[PDB]
Amino acid sequence: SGFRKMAFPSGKVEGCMVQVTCGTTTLNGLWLDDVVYCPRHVICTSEDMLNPNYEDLLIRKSNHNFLVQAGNVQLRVIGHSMQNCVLKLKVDTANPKTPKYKFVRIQPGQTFSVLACYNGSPSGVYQCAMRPNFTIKGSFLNGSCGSVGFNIDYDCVSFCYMHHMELPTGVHAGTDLEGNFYGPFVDRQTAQAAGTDTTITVNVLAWLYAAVINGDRWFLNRFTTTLNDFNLVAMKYNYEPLTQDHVDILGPLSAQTGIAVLDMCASLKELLQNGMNGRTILGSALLEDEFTPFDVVRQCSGVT
Amino acid sequence: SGFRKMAFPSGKVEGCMVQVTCGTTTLNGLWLDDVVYCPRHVICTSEDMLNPNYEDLLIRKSNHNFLVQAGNVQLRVIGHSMQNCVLKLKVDTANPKTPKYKFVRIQPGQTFSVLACYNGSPSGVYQCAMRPNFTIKGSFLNGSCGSVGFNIDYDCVSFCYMHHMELPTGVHAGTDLEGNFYGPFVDRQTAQAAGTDTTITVNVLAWLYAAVINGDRWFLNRFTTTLNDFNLVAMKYNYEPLTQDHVDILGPLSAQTGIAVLDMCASLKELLQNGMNGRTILGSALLEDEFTPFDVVRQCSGVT
Ligand SMILES: Cc1cnccc1N1CCC(C(=O)NC2(C#N)CC2)CC1
């Protein structure tokens, strides 16, 4: 037992990280087959980032201006193209460590692992969630751009995020691996403010189920509620509305614990209204929302 | 910016995980060079675990009773020996993926990454700390034993933990890679209660420095204190005493922020006495103690 914020094992993604340099800008690339994917802003000077015309800046760049290094070995760039906000650098060598992989675009509330990298070299791995305002709360310094987010289903890596930007408020924005930003964000150094960072209700409920499975039971109360009544309280507390789809997803955890989803919603309603009174759940003094129901089942069942 | 509970990239350790089966017991082993290390309780029947005589149980075991599988390939066991609470299974094949490595015995308050495994297959990676009572708060199900804890210095893996036991209170105990338990724990299914789980003060202070570096500044107050005055409050709150050695270790973070260590201790003293008043620091409503000062510098500087 015990319940931890757990990342996927990072080895399959470590095998794909490379360094990409263009002029004086270095960041990370993702090497899959004979393509390296990286943020298009690799071509920007610090001055360029204010109002960059990427099509115009890219005209001044040739294949030989993209320096791609895998470990301490140089890869030969034989083509480049821009797709949305990513560059695809065709290299003459397929990555021999390419895992089975997919590109997926996740929904707000979905969790993934980030392999934070600098100069193509892995620094650390952590779990986060796509927030309801399409930001992520990461840990990214200068040269972390092109670090990726992913999920693993057995031996298949689903890449869902590539890091591009830090907003003036220190939260993070990026793209899927087709180069489309999550949410309204752009790869320019300009006024971009995030909307409300609401709490991912379905994920809190999953985590409360994890708490019961792991013996933390004090918050269970004698009440129930309805989706509509719960949602009036969720709204007041900047929680995402709970849908019947979410109730259905929490079905397997409902079955495992014998606690009806709406009973757990009524326990959550009291926690919101009453607070924790100085108590902890799974070692947290706040209600954790970066575990999906699938995460809780996966971790509570030991999937590899 | 941003500050996350970050594990080391797990790839170098994934390359070392194997499955070890003895009779009807399966758990994990660590394959380094031509030795597989695993908990000696692999030889126990559930009945054996109550009062096991490991020397006597081991007499009934031969090399061929230890089944070691690396991926879906069988390794030939050509020797076995017991060292403290681990078995060393000599195999006829050096692990071709053996990283540079060391075995280290860590001190309470030191952090490390765990690669949670089942049947030799990696499930997830998370960061934890050696608690002052020599437990760890992990996430371990049946068949997680032999999962390891480690730190990485560039390309050298320092293995510091191997998982053996879950106490009746759901906290975890294990050994270094010489098979010596951390703290007073034994590999028997008997009454073993943990002592006080005190808070790792030096680590809280490091994390408060991380908070200031990442813009969370509200808790900084107009006060200072002395080690002796602080330690009277630490004692009252089940915090570890702060030593001049800890003050020296927090030196580089003191330098980076311009906040004297004793001023930060006085901010911590007020947080202990006043609580958070519903506020958060780096997204936590409690004072986080599983980042060492070295962790905070490493993450705030982007070491790979
Ligand atoms: C910190 C960070 C995190 N994640 C992605 C990017 C990040 N930074 C964005 C601003 C960059 C910068 O300082 N640019 C200027 C210059 N010269 C204009 C000031 C540094 C990197």
Ligand SMILES: Cc1cnccc1N1CCC(C(=O)NC2(C#N)CC2)CC1
């Ligand atoms: C859950 C866990 C976590 N970390 C390490 C070990 C862990 N378990 C220890 C008790 C085991 C067990 O059920 N043994 C009996 C039988 N049959 C006597 C009941 C199961 C594995």
